[PDB]
Amino acid sequence: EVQLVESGGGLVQPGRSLRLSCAASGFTFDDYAMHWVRQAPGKGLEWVSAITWNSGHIDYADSVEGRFTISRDNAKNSLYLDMNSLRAEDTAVYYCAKVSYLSTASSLDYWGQGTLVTVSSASTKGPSVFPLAPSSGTAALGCLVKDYFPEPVTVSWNSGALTSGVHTFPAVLQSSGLYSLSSVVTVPSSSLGTQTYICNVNHKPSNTKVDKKI
Amino acid sequence: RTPSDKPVAHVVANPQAEGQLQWLNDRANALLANGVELRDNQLVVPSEGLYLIYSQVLFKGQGCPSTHVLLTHTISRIAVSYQTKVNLLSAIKSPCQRETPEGAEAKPWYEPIYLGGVFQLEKGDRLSAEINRPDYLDFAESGQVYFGIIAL
Amino acid sequence: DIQMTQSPSSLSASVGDRVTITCRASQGIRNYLAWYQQKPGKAPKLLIYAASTLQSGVPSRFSGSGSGTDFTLTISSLQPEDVATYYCQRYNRAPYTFGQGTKVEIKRTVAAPSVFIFPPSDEQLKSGTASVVCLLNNFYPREAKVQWKVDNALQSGNSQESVTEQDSKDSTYSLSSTLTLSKADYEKHKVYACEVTHQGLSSPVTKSFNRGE
Question: SS3 for A84?
Fold first, then answer.
């Protein structure tokens, strides 16, 4: 069905630049205007730009015009956003949205999952993954994900085979300027000699996967 | 901008001008040259001559309400001798026929209107492109509403 | 120009209670207004467009209304999964600006947290940093007060909370205080406890552990 797969995000030195991508599928891409909408962390939603089906008209925000450039390959069913001269205010999760009916002036009927763009002169750090192992009715265990930059990491459990009782917590920025997470699961005080748990962590910025036992 | 000494104007609507049809000259592929001027929102003729005059307007809405609203678009001549005004070109349009989808669901409707024709005009005649319901205009995209003339 | 202004900014309500969110435009927009639901971290979903038309596949407890400047999103019977932030949007006419947003949260009865403490792992100790982790789990209401003690001496300075969003089935939260000292400071101490006061608790609950069990 309708899918809007974003890519292109990541860390970037201020002043440099980035080309976000959005690959569409499940609908005749050629018949719809598209939108970019960003969302700065903790802040609300903010329209960024739009482009008609045949690329003949383009709108940007009382906030960019000169820096960003929305574009569109219909053969490849893709939407692009080239961002230039980036500052921290551009740091945000960027969504592509398919319009509801043809024109740019139509409701955003389907959104991609986002792609985060972090503007910083820092540098990526893969995370150190540690186990939160249970103590000596119901009991608890989890993965402590430590010392990473930038966001996000994603934690899965047994590669999906465990979704209930799972609590991946918001990331915390430490005095080190690095992040740390933990997800936790509550499991039967019994099914432990019989089962051993794995927390599948992805940090795409640092390009590191770490599966882990607890 | 631009060679050719034939008086011309292709003007375009102000989107950021709610509640009326305002013609902008200072944009895009908009024209206004060789003596033609845009003044009390009217195109002004610099010379006796034959002129092709055109305008297009694009109305829109979502769903249908009170049994009927009719859209119209006209080009008027107001004259330097005939200090009065007359339609050169007109057209009325009826979108959504009462329908009122009171079951549910409100769909996008769009209704464009094109006016074009050749007229003899006198120096200083003022051309006017008007609609009845400016609030039903689509201000969202480029080549959608406009008003032009050219001397032949 | 154009200001999309939704009131209120936040609201708590009871499951089953009917909820009302409003949107005022600084200039008329006919019915070119849509409502978007956004759950924590997820992509936003379209609920209503043209002020009143439910998107297909969207539960019918959701309703909208209004033309011109004042609009209203209504959830006739609030539900645990309806916990989200809702945004109105203008779509006439660019710029396609969104209201500031409205957070929606829930009733439920009080729920005491289940407290679990975790000692640092060895790979951690190997490294030179030690991290003790107190977990409060599935409590309600949101407000709790973790306390870290070492050898029954309060330890203020090296801890950090983080809280989940209101869960979409049980409507509870879960929280995690975290102690971090230099491995060296980890060893000037033997007994590590985290005390926890919540409203669903008659009295503060500690969960200690001796370093080296």
Answer: coil
